[PDB]
Design an enzyme around this catalytic site. Structure first.
Site, PDB file in Angstrom:
ATOM      1  N   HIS B  41      26.384  32.199  56.579  1.00  0.00           N
ATOM      2  CA  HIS B  41      27.189  33.215  55.895  1.00  0.00           C
ATOM      3  C   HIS B  41      28.579  32.704  55.450  1.00  0.00           C
ATOM      4  O   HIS B  41      29.282  33.438  54.767  1.00  0.00           O
ATOM      5  CB  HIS B  41      27.297  34.547  56.672  1.00  0.00           C
ATOM      6  CG  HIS B  41      28.091  34.500  57.941  1.00  0.00           C
ATOM      7  ND1 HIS B  41      29.464  34.408  57.928  1.00  0.00           N
ATOM      8  CD2 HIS B  41      27.670  34.610  59.223  1.00  0.00           C
ATOM      9  CE1 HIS B  41      29.839  34.416  59.200  1.00  0.00           C
ATOM     10  NE2 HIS B  41      28.791  34.534  60.016  1.00  0.00           N
ATOM     11  N   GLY B 143      36.775  35.474  62.944  1.00  0.00           N
ATOM     12  CA  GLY B 143      36.992  34.033  62.915  1.00  0.00           C
ATOM     13  C   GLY B 143      36.341  33.277  64.060  1.00  0.00           C
ATOM     14  O   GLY B 143      36.479  32.055  64.148  1.00  0.00           O
ATOM     15  N   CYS B 145      33.046  33.155  64.452  1.00  0.00           N
ATOM     16  CA  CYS B 145      31.741  32.752  63.941  1.00  0.00           C
ATOM     17  C   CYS B 145      31.586  31.250  64.024  1.00  0.00           C
ATOM     18  O   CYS B 145      32.465  30.510  63.605  1.00  0.00           O
ATOM     19  CB  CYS B 145      31.532  33.253  62.512  1.00  0.00           C
ATOM     20  SG  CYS B 145      31.704  35.043  62.314  1.00  0.00           S
TER      21      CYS B 145
END
Ligand SMILES: COCCO[C@@H](C(=O)Nc1cncc2ccccc12)c1ccc(Cl)c(Cl)c1
Ligand SMILES: COCCO[C@H](C(=O)Nc1cncc2ccccc12)c1ccc(Cl)c(Cl)c1
Ligand SMILES: [Cl-]
Lengths: 305, 300
Positions: B41, B143, B145
């Site tokens: 993503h 943030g 991820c």
């Protein structure tokens, strides 16, 4: 979202763990620059431990008696000295993985990460608090002596604890990195018991602020209290007194959540007198006291190391 | 003595954390050998989030669009590929701090350590369990991820999780290190909800065995139960069924403490019916389900 018991990343400390062997005893050492720090009880036998004269025991030791091992490399001990209950072994090689570090003595209520080691090898890391009775509720097996407690400030590791022993109730006693014990304990086989513990009030309030930031608000109420009235209630529940310093430290969390410190104190006062009534806060049915106000801010803001 | 929620030392994993930037999006990557793994993503914009066609979005990308940063050193991306929901960025430098590692997909109830990162920098480490509903109750901000879940058994790091997103209830969804999501989740902003969570029964029993090893016995009783009668009781309290595999796995703890599995099951039945009555087990007023039988033996 989420609130977890979170330790500091242990990498900078793993690079310092070594195995220290003296006779039959094998424990852990902290290798910083050209010195290995470890509990002085490594020089003791089963008889020595009962009533040891560490100055006399150490004078009989030679550098070759201490076998220091960093991984699969044996370090050469070129000197030995004692600072309180810690033994300092000068080695011929400076640890290339030595981080920027300081030795700091912490106060009751303060938290730190423990890197549990066995045979100079890190097996786990966990977050604990220095209890008001100066013990730590660690998780330690035989051989963990020399495991260290630490915090990380920016890129600087502050070493605050070194594990020495386990008390009869299963709690742990140890020293700062200068060999000064936390609490009224000694490194001698004798009757020693941890004092009656108390709950770290400022940390419980910090954790209630962490629950509010996470969406848990059932415990909030319309009430406030005076600092003195709160302290009179808290002392009756074996809670540490809350000082003006603690109220000031909780300021940013009060500003963020919109809940004044004395307002959260009135919620804590009600929780103590009435209980949780089947409800939980951050997945816990007890008030958690091992998250300091700084820990809560750091975790709810994502400060990196 | 003592029982703590204990994470694996995070050093071997810290040496792999890098920052991956693609346009406005910045998240974390796992740098192993000459490949950086990160959630796919990262290539998404705000408009291509509800229904992104990742194959089409990635074909429009060039290597110089991906800015990879390991500390204060920018890595050069020399290739890009996608394996399920993970993006693989081939780089021109092999990570010198790459540990001995494996990619392992775990099952519900299994535990692992999470190294939470922001901008390729580790901020904290904690212990998690893969919930029976395939979510993790992590502690993650925007943030995070690309932060990974791992176990470090005997010199080798087994990577089992990569964080992708937060669900509306605050729980987290992610993939194994091959990009396959755990659970019925997708990396799209479509309406997704975690299923009704349940208690990891085998882990609660393992934790009751740890409490006995630690000297806590107040919860033990003279009773035993059939596996079926236990499961009928457990299911009424939102507890996962206990299978014969779980009973077998609890064998060594049963042998060490001298308490049969079905005997401890009767203790668990009683606790579920009565509650704790002001008492604690291992400093907890709730039954803890994020310690597996393997964790208990290892820690004790
Ligand atoms: C750095 O890029 C982040 C992109 O946002 C992600 C996102 O929810 N991650 C975050 C991770 N963990 C905790 C969070 C807590 C607050 C907010 C966000 C969190 C996200 C959003 C929707 C989808 Cl469908 C996907 Cl695939 C990913
Ligand atoms: C390598 O041998 C170290 C022996 O340390 C003992 C000792 O209790 N330490 C241990 C440390 N931590 C956890 C333990 C859990 C089970 C058993 C021991 C544990 C000990 C006993 C009494 C005294 Cl006065 C001293 Cl200085 C040290
Ligand atoms: Cl572990």
């Amino acid at each position: 979202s989420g609130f977890r018991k979170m330790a500091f990343p242990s990498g900078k400390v793993e690079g310092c763990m070594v195995q220290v062997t003296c006779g039959t005893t094998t424990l852990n050492g902290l290798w910083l620059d050209d010195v290995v720090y470890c509990p002085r009880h490594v020089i003791c036998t089963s008889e020595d431990m009962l009533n040891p004269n560490y100055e006399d025991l150490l004078i009989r030791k030679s550098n070759h008696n201490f076998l220091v091992q960093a991984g699969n490399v044996q370090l050469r001990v070129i000197g030995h000295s004692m600072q309180n209950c810690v033994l300092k072994l000068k080695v011929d090689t400076a640890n290339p993985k030595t981080p920027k570090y300081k030795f700091v003595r912490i106060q009751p209520g303060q938290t730190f990460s423990v890197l549990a080691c066995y045979n100079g090898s890190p097996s786990g890391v966990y977050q604990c608090a220095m209890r008001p009775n100066f013990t730590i509720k660690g998780s330690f097996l035989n051989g963990s002596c020399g495991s260290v407690g630490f915090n990380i400030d920016y890129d600087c590791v502050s070493f605050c604890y070194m594990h020495h022993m386990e008390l009869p109730t299963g709690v742990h006693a140890g020293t700062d990195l200068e060999g000064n014990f936390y609490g009224p304990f000694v490194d001698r086989q004798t009757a020693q018991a941890a004092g009656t513990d108390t709950t770290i009030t400022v940390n419980v309030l910090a954790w209630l602020y962490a629950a509010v930031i996470n969406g848990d608000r059932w415990f909030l109420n319309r009430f406030t209290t005076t600092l003195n009235d709160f302290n009179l209630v808290a002392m009756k529940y074996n809670y540490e007194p809350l000082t003006q310093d603690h109220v000031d430290i909780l300021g940013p969390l009060s500003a963020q959540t919109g809940i004044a410190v004395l307002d959260m104190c009135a919620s804590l006062k009600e929780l103590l007198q009435n209980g949780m009534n089947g409800r939980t806060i951050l997945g816990s049915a007890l008030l958690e006291d091992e998250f300091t106000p700084f820990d809560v801010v750091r975790q709810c803001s994502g400060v990196t190391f």
